[PDB]
C-alpha cells in the first residue's frame with residue numbers, strides 16, 4: 001500500500017512551479033485541506049509527499065511548465081503526475097496504485113494551507 | 127515555523143534502527159498515533175518527517191544504536207535527535223525550534239501505526 | 253527521434269543481470285548483432301545504449317530478477333524494459349518512442365558480440 | 379580492448395563546446411561518419427562514446443575553451459583529448475590504448491551526422 | 505582526537521565568503537600563521553581543514569552572510585563555526601572537541617599566508 | 631603552485647590500502663614525519679592532502695591493489711600516484727608540478743605519525 005514503509009510517495013519535477021496536495025475523505029467530518037507548495041528551482045526538484053492520519057483520500061497535481069513524475073519507494077518506474085484537478089493523481093488509502101481521478105467537486109470545500117501541507121521539496125544539501 | 131515550505135523536517139541516521147513518530151495534541155478528540163519506521167541500511171539514511179493536519183504536537187526519537195540528527199530546510203546545522211520519550215525531539219505546532227520534551231505520559235494512549243506513519247526513508251535512487 | 257542529441261537512450265537497473273542489445277535492420281546487407289552486457293552490481297546501475305550507424309532496428313531486453321526502466325534524454329519518465337525477445341523493447345530508427353516488438357525471428361542468425369556491443373554500464377567514478 | 383565491457387570510453391569536459399566523432403575504416407565500403415555533439419553546460423559534462431559495429435577506426439576531438447579528458451572504464455586516470463583532426467584522439471579497433479593520429483585525409487569523405495552520432499552527453503537526472 | 509583518521513575536520517558553508525585558519529601554539533617558538541581562503545560559490549561549499557605538524561592550537565572563523573558548520577569525520581552532527589576571533593572555533597591539539605575560544609590576542613602577531621594555508625575548498629569534479 | 635587556493639591536492643583511490651605522506655625539508659632542522667592513512671573502502675576513496683607550514687618537501691605513495699591518481703584543483707587530469715618511496719609522488723614547495731623522486735634516504739629518520747598526518751579520506755556523508 002502506498003505511504004507504508006517500502007512504498008513511500010516521491011515526486012520529481014523540472015523547472016519552477018507548484019505541487020498542490022488535496023487531503024480529503026477525512027473521518028468524522030474532518031475539514032478537507034488544499035495547499036500549494038512552490039519550488040523556484042530551474043532544474044530537478046525531488047519531493048516527499050506524506051498523508052495525514054485520519055484521511056482516506058490524497059490527490060495532487062503539478063502546475064509548472066516542466067515535467068513531473070511520481071516514484072513509489074525505491075521502484076525504478078517514474079510516471080507522469082496529473083496537471084489539473086479534473087485529471088489529478090489520486091491515492092485511495094490502502095491502494096498500491098496512483099490513479100487518475102477528477103476531484104473538482106472536492107476542491108471548493110477544502111481549507112487553504114498554501115506552504116503548510118504535507119508535501120516537501122528536498123534541499124541541495126541533504 | 128518547522129513543517130512550512132523552507133523549514134521542512136529532515137533526519138539523517140547512520141546504521142539500522144527505528145525512527146518513531148508520536149503525533150499528538152489532536153483537535154476534536156483525535157486519537158494520538160505512535161509508529162516506528164525501520165531502516166536496515168548499514169550506511170547513511172536520509173528521511174523526511176511530516177506532520178498530520180489537525181494535530182498540534184509532533185515528537186520523535188531514534189531507537190537505533192548509531193547517530194541521528196535533524197536538519198531544518200536547507201540549513202547547514204544538524205543536531206542530535208532524542209533517543210527516549212523522556213527526552214524526545216518535540217515540535218509545538220508553529221514553533222521554529224525542536225525542543226527536548228518528556229512525552230512518556232502521551233505514549234500509552236497513542237494507537238500503534240508501526241510502518242504506517244508520516245516519516246519516510248529516502249531510497250538509493252532519488 | 254531517440255539517439256539524437258537531447259533524446260539519448262539511458263537504462264536504469266537494480267541488481268545483477270544482463271542487458272542484451274540486438275542491432276538489426278542493417279542497410280547494405282549488414283549482418284545482425286546480438287550481445288549481452290552483464291553487471292554484478294547489487295544496487296542501481298545506470299547505462300548508456302548507443303545505436304550503430306547503418307542499422308535501422310535496435311531491440312533490447314533485461315534478464316535479471318530486479319527491475320529495469322529506460323529514460324530518454326533528461327526526461328523524467330522511466331518505463332519498464334522488455335524481459336524477453338518476444339516482447340523486446342524496440343526502436344525503429346527515426347522514432348521518438350520505444351515500442352514492444354517480437355524479434356525472436358532475428359535472434360538465431362545474429363552474430364554474437366557478448367561484452368562487445370554498443371551498451372555500456374556507467375561506472376561509480378564518472 | 380577499449381569499447382569492451384570494463385573498458386568503456388568516457389569523456390569529461392569543462393564549459394561549452396563540441397565533441398566530434400569520426401567513425402571510419404568501415405568494412406564493405408561503409409561510408410565514414412563525422413558528427414559534432416554540442417554542450418552549452420558551463421561546468422563539467424560527462425560523456426559516453428560508442429563505436430559502431432562494422433567500423434575499425436574511431437577518432438574524436440574537443441573544440442572548446444575548457445579542458446577535455448578521457449577515462450577508460452572505471453579506471454582513475456583522465457588524460458587530454460585531441461583538439462584538431464591532425465592530432466585526433468584515435469582508437470584502432472582492438473587496441474587498449476588511445477593514440478594520436480592525423481585523420482585530416484579521412485574527414486572530407488565522411489558524411490555529416492551532427493547531433494546524430496554515437497557520442498552522448500549524460501543528463502543532470504541520471 | 506580531531507585530525508586523527510576517523511576524526512577529520514570538515515566544513516560546510518553556504519554562499520560566498522572567507523574561511524580563515526589561525527595556526528598557533530607552535531613548539532620551540534615556531535611563528536603563528538593566519539590565512540583567509542575565499543570561495544565565490546553561490547551555493548554549498550565543502551572544505552577539508554588540516555593541522556600543521558609541530559603546532560598545538562588551531563582556530564578558525566567564517567566571514568560570509570551564509571551559514572557555516574563543521575563536521576568531525578563521518579559524524580552526522582554539523583555545528584556552527586565561529587564568526588569572530590573573540591568566539592573562534594578552536595581545537596586544542598589532542599582534544600576530540602571544538603570549543604569556543606577568544607584568540608583576538610593571537611591574531612596580530614601571526615604571519616599572513618592568505619590563499620596559502622591548510623584549509624581547502626573541494627571542487628565540483630571530485 | 632600546488633597547495634595554493636585553486637591548486638589544492640586531491641587524490642582518488644580504488645579499493646583498500648594506505649596513502650602514506652612524508653613531510654620533510656623542514657626549516658631549522660624540524661623533524662621529518664611519515665604517516666600512513668588507511669582506507670577500507672571497496673570502491674572509490676577521495677582524499678585531500680595538505681602541506682604543513684615550515685616544510686619544503688611533500689612526498690606520498692599509495693600501497694594497494696587498486697589505482698591511485700592525483701588531481702590539482704578543479705583540473706580534469708588525473709595522473710598516477712607513486713607506489714614506492716624510490717618512485718614517490720613528490721612536490722617541491724612552490725612547484726606547480728608533481729614529480730617522481732626517490733626519498734628512500736629520508737624515510738629512516740622520519741618520526742612515525744600513522745593515522746595522524748595531513749592527508750584525509752573524505753567520508754560518505756560530506
Ligand SMILES: CC(=O)N[C@H]1[C@H](O[C@@H]2[C@@H](O)[C@@H](O)O[C@H](CO)[C@@H]2O)O[C@H](CO)[C@@H](O[C@@H]2O[C@@H](C)[C@@H](O)[C@@H](O)[C@@H]2O)[C@@H]1O[C@@H]1O[C@H](CO)[C@H](O)[C@H](O)[C@H]1O
Nearest residue numbers: 279280304305306307308345346408409410411489491494
Ligand atoms: C535513403 C537511405 O537509405 N539513405 C541512406 C543512404 O543510402 C543511400 C541510397 O539511398 C542511395 O543514395 O545510394 C547512396 C550511395 O551514395 C546511399 O546508399 O546511405 C547512408 C549510408 O549507408 C545511410 O546513412 C547511414 O545509415 C543510417 C541508418 C544512419 O546510421 C546514418 O547515420 C548512416 O550514415 C542513409 O540512411 C539514412 O540516413 C539519414 C541520415 O540523415 C537518416 O538517418 C535516415 O533515417 C536514414 O534512412
Ligand SMILES: CC(=O)N[C@H]1[C@H](O[C@@H]2[C@@H](O)[C@@H](O)O[C@H](CO)[C@@H]2O)O[C@H](CO)[C@@H](O[C@@H]2O[C@@H](C)[C@@H](O)[C@@H](O)[C@@H]2O)[C@@H]1O[C@@H]1O[C@H](CO)[C@H](O)[C@H](O)[C@H]1O
Nearest residue numbers: 282283284285363365368369405430431432433434471472
Ligand atoms: C576478418 C573480418 O573481416 N571479419 C569480419 C567479418 O567478415 C566476414 C568475411 O571475412 C567473410 O568471412 O564473410 C563473412 C560473411 O559470411 C563475414 O563478412 O564480418 C563480421 C560481420 O559479419 C565482422 O564483425 C563486424 O565488424 C567488426 C569491426 C565489429 O564491429 C563486429 O562487432 C562486427 O560484427 C568481422 O570483423 C571482425 O570481427 C571480430 C569479431 O570478434 C573482431 O572484432 C575483429 O576485430 C573484426 O575485424
Ligand SMILES: CC(=O)N[C@@H]1[C@@H](O[C@@H]2O[C@H](CO)[C@H](O)[C@H](O)[C@H]2O)[C@H](O[C@@H]2O[C@@H](C)[C@@H](O)[C@@H](O)[C@@H]2O)[C@@H](CO)O[C@H]1O
Nearest residue numbers: 027052053054055056093094156157158159237239242243
Ligand atoms: C474502520 C475505520 O474507519 N476505522 C477507523 C480508523 O481508520 C482505519 O484505520 C486502520 C488502522 O489500521 C486502517 O488504516 C484503515 O484503512 C482505516 O480505515 C482510524 O484510524 C485513523 O485513520 C486512518 C485513516 C489512519 O490514518 C490511521 O493511522 C489513523 O489512526 C481510527 C482513529 O482512531 O478510527 C477508526 O474508527
Ligand SMILES: CC(=O)N[C@@H]1[C@@H](O[C@@H]2O[C@H](CO)[C@H](O)[C@H](O)[C@H]2O)[C@H](O[C@@H]2O[C@@H](C)[C@@H](O)[C@@H](O)[C@@H]2O)[C@@H](CO)O[C@H]1O
Nearest residue numbers: 030031032033111112113116153178179180181182219220
Ligand atoms: C483557533 C483554531 O483552533 N483554529 C483551528 C485550526 O487550527 C489552526 O489552523 C491554522 C491554519 O492556518 C494554524 O495552523 C494554527 O496554528 C492552527 O491552530 C484548524 O486547522 C487544522 O488543524 C491545524 C492544527 C493545522 O493542521 C491545519 O492545517 C488544519 O487545517 C481548523 C480546521 O479544522 O479548525 C480551526 O478551529
Ligand SMILES: CC(=O)N[C@@H]1[C@@H](O[C@@H]2O[C@H](CO)[C@H](O)[C@H](O)[C@H]2O)[C@H](O[C@@H]2O[C@@H](C)[C@@H](O)[C@@H](O)[C@@H]2O)[C@@H](CO)O[C@H]1O
Nearest residue numbers: 531556557558559560597598660661662663741743746747
Ligand atoms: C612535546 C612532547 O612530549 N613530544 C614532542 C612532540 O609533540 C607530541 O607529539 C606526539 C606524537 O605522538 C603527540 O601528538 C603529542 O600530542 C605531541 O605533544 C613533537 O611532535 C611534533 O609536534 C606535534 C605537535 C605533532 O604535530 C607531531 O606530529 C609532530 O611530530 C616532537 C617533534 O617536534 O617533539 C617532541 O618532544
Ligand SMILES: CC(=O)N[C@@H]1[C@@H](O[C@@H]2O[C@H](CO)[C@H](O)[C@H](O)[C@H]2O)[C@H](O[C@@H]2O[C@@H](C)[C@@H](O)[C@@H](O)[C@@H]2O)[C@@H](CO)O[C@H]1O
Nearest residue numbers: 534535536537615617620621657682683684685686723724
Ligand atoms: C626564506 C624566506 O624567504 N621566507 C621564510 C618563510 O618561507 C617562505 O614563505 C613564503 C610565503 O609566501 C613562500 O611560501 C616561500 O616560498 C617560503 O620560502 C617561512 O615561512 C614558513 O615556512 C614556509 C615554508 C611556509 O610554510 C610559510 O607559510 C611558513 O609561515 C618563514 C618562517 O616563519 O621564514 C621566512 O624567512
